[PDB]
Design a binder for this molecule. Structure first.
Ligand SMILES: Cc1ccc(-n2nc(C(C)(C)C)cc2NC(=O)Nc2cccc(Nc3ccnc4ccc(N)cc34)c2)cc1
Ligand SMILES: CCCCCCCCO[C@@H]1O[C@H](CO)[C@@H](O)[C@H](O)[C@H]1O
Ligand SMILES: CCCCCCCCO[C@@H]1O[C@H](CO)[C@@H](O)[C@H](O)[C@H]1O
Length: 339
């Protein structure tokens, strides 16, 4: 059963992997892990192999390692990264200290595409349809991505898109919902839709919607488009500290998106309006967006599946590193590759 491994140092790092993975070359690195591209001799596909750094060196790292394995083991959707393989050199729980994660290699990402060419509307539809299809699925398992941005969207020569998390340690803040920027301590799925909002806009116009140089600037850039909060929303913020200091900022009206996104498809503009509402309660959800008329060429409610129940209870446990490691060991041990 157990495969035979080989060994090589790549950059500063030891990479011990089953023979089937060949032609290893580094594609990026940092505090959360390193990745190599590689050829999977078993399938004939290019794959990405992620070695987690110091997976069990702290509690937080331990919980992070478990979190990522569990999440990735559960994801089974065309528009979301999937696990091809997870493996460890270790022969048992006691030797156990290294975790490798394997997925399809992604060609490249959506950020490249944006710069190197401008985009047709049919293309924009295709790209955004796929992101929301993926997000419907992720949101159905009560997972929030939280860091949707063009560099976490991998797209192939065929325009097939997968959502992932390229991060291994073009500001994230450019796509971040106004409430995250405010350290609102209980934010929800709609943060994701804000981000899709920022991406679509960018895909249509060619440039960053809100290219803020810091958190304060970011809110200024936003409020110039969506306008200062109104009373029905100020009523939702019962902090007197807040309300009175926002009202002391010179008012800013809501722009009409129709006068902003010039020469774009009316339907794109309407959808955007539904996504970039300041009040997260009023934003369109992923499920609802897939049905909007902008995606009539693509929509099919019989092919927009939801995720199987996903047990998240571990998130609210406070455990020992060896326990998180043991649990991660079980999940390695029980992995069944997809056909
Ligand atoms: C602590 C933690 C928890 C979860 C994650 N997530 N979350 C997700 C969602 C399902 C929510 C999109 C995905 C991840 N992790 C994830 O994508 N990990 C991962 C695993 C293996 C390889 C890669 N990176 C690459 C994948 C594909 N092609 C690449 C090409 C070049 C390159 N440098 C990296 C990759 C990312 C990441 C970290
Ligand atoms: C170009 C390099 C050729 C490498 C081919 C890798 C084939 C690995 O061989 C495989 O793995 C296991 C041991 O690793 C064996 O038990 C199996 O026979 C086989 O499934
Ligand atoms: C700088 C002015 C503040 C603009 C921030 C917009 C407020 C975000 O919107 C808020 O998101 C909260 C988080 O879940 C929800 O509890 C509220 O229902 C929603 O109104």
């Amino acid at each position: 059963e157990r495969p035979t491994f080989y060994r090589q140092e790549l950059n500063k790092t030891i990479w011990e992997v089953p023979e089937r993975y060949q032609n290893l070359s580094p594609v990026g690195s940092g505090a959360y892990g390193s990745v190599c591209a590689a050829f999977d001799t078993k399938t004939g596909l290019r794959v990405a192999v992620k070695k987690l750094s110091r997976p069990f060196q702290s509690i937080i790292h331990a919980k992070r390692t478990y979190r990522e394995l569990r999440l990735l083991k559960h994801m089974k959707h065309e528009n979301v990264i999937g696990l091809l393989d997870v493996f460890t050199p270790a022969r048992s729980l006691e030797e156990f200290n290294d975790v490798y994660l394997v997925t399809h290699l992604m060609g490249a990402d959506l950020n490249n595409i944006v710069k190197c060419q401008k985009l047709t509307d049919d293309h924009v539809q295709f790209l955004i349809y796929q992101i929301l299809r993926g997000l419907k699925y992720i949101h159905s398992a009560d997972i929030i991505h939280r860091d949707l941005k063009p560099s976490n969207l991998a797209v192939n020569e065929d325009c097939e898109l997968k959502i992932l998390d390229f991060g291994l340690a073009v500001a994230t803040r450019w796509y971040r919902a106004p409430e995250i920027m405010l350290n609102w301590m209980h934010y929800n799925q709609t943060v994701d839709i804000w981000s899709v909002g920022c991406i679509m806009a960018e895909l249509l116009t060619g440039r960053t919607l809100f290219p803020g140089t810091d958190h304060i600037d970011q809110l200024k850039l936003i409020l110039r488009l969506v306008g200062t909060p109104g009373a029905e929303l100020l009523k939702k913020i019962s902090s007197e500290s807040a309300r009175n200091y926002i009202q002391s900022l010179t008012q800013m009206p809501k722009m009409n998106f129709a006068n902003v996104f010039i020469g774009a498809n009316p339907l794109a503009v309407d959808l955007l309006e539904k996504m970039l509402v300041l009040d997260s309660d009023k934003r369109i959800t992923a499920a609802q967006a897939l049905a909007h008329a902008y995606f009539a060429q693509y929509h099919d409610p019989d092919d927009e599946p939801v995720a199987d129940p996903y047990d998240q209870s571990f998130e609210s446990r406070d455990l020992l590193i060896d326990e998180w490691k043991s649990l991660t060991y079980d999940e390695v041990i029980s992995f069944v590759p997809p056909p």
